[PDB]
């Protein structure tokens, strides 16, 4: 028998454009990120790796504009918007930039640049 | 393993 081997994160694209002069990939369409009890969506995603030894993946995405969505067991889902949104995988963390809105279960926040949790 | 993804064009999926 043969088939799949591993799916640690699920990812889909409508249109990919690969850099045949170098290495970078442009993503376009409705790119999804699945990670635990959060998701992200964009048109634009870019993939970069600024350090080989420590396997240092990083991505970002925007234009949709990029949003968070979270589904919560206690019946309190949460979301937010930004002009820019980055996922520094090699730093365990996420940042919003430009007109960053987040709603928490308690209140909302709206500003320049806002930190987010996994 | 490398990055892998499905496509709304190809239907079949691929590695990067």
Swiss-Prot record, chain A:
GO biological process: Gram-negative-bacterium-type cell outer membrane assembly; lipopolysaccharide transport
A cellular component annotation (GO) from this entry: cell outer membrane
Keyword Signal on entry: yes
Source organism of the structure: Escherichia coli (strain K12)
Protein name, as recorded: Lipopolysaccharide export system protein LptA
Quaternary structure (record): Component of the lipopolysaccharide transport and assembly complex. Can form head-to-tail homodimers and oligomers. Interacts with LptC, LptD and with the lipid A domain of LPS.
KW Transport (keyword) present: yes
Recorded superkingdom: Bacteria
Entry keywords, A to Z: Periplasm, Signal, Transport
Chief location bin: periplasm
GO MF assignments: glycolipid transfer activity; identical protein binding; lipopolysaccharide binding
Location of this fragment in the whole protein: 28 to 145 of 185
Localization, UniProt: Periplasm
Domain comment, as recorded: The N-terminal domain interacts with LptC, at the inner membrane, and the C-terminal domain interacts with LptD, at the outer membrane.
Protein purpose: Involved in the assembly of lipopolysaccharide (LPS). Required for the translocation of LPS from the inner membrane to the outer membrane. May form a bridge between the inner membrane and the outer membrane, via interactions with LptC and LptD, thereby facilitating LPS transfer across the periplasm.
Effect annotated for changing residue 49 to D/E: No change in activity
Disruption phenotype: Results in an earlier growth arrest and onset of cell lethality.
Induction remarks: Transcriptionally regulated by sigma-E factor.
Similarity comment text for this entry: Belongs to the LptA family.
Curated annotation (Swiss-Prot), chain B:
One CC-aspect GO term: extracellular region
Residue range from the parent sequence: 6 to 21 of 21
Disulphide-bridged cysteine pairs: 6-13
UniProt domain comment: Four regions are important for the activity: the C-terminal loop, the last three C-terminal residues, the stretch of seven N-terminal residues and residues 8-9 are necessary for the antifungal activity and dispensable for antibacterial activity.
The protein's name in its UniProt record: Thanatin
Localization: Secreted
Function noted in UniProt: Insect defense peptide with a broad spectrum of activity against Gram-positive and Gram-negative bacteria and fungi. No activity against S.aureus. Stops respiration in bacteria but does not permeabilize their inner membranes.
Superkingdom as given in the UniProt entry: Eukaryota
Keyword Disulfide bond: yes
Keyword tags: Antibiotic, Antimicrobial, Disulfide bond, Fungicide, Immunity, Innate immunity, Secreted
Swiss-Prot/TrEMBL GO biological process terms: defense response to bacterium; defense response to fungus; innate immune response; killing of cells of another organism
């Amino acid at each position: 028998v043969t088939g799949d081997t591993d799916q640690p994160i699920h990812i889909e694209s409508d249109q990919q454009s690969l850099d045949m002069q170098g290495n970078v990939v442009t993503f376009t369409g409705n790119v999804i990120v699945t990670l635990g009890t959060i998701k992200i969506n964009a048109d634009k995603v870019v993939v970069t790796r600024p350090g080989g030894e420590q396997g240092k993946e990083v991505i970002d995405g925007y234009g949709k504009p990029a949003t968070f969505y979270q589904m919560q067991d206690n019946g309190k889902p949460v979301e937010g918007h930004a002009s820019q949104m980055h996922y520094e995988l090699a730093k365990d963390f996420v940042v919003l930039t430009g007109n960053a809105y987040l709603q928490q279960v308690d209140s909302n926040i709206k500003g320049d640049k806002i930190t987010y949790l996994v | 393993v490398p990055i892998t993804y499905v496509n709304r064009a190809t239907x079949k999926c691929a590695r990067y």
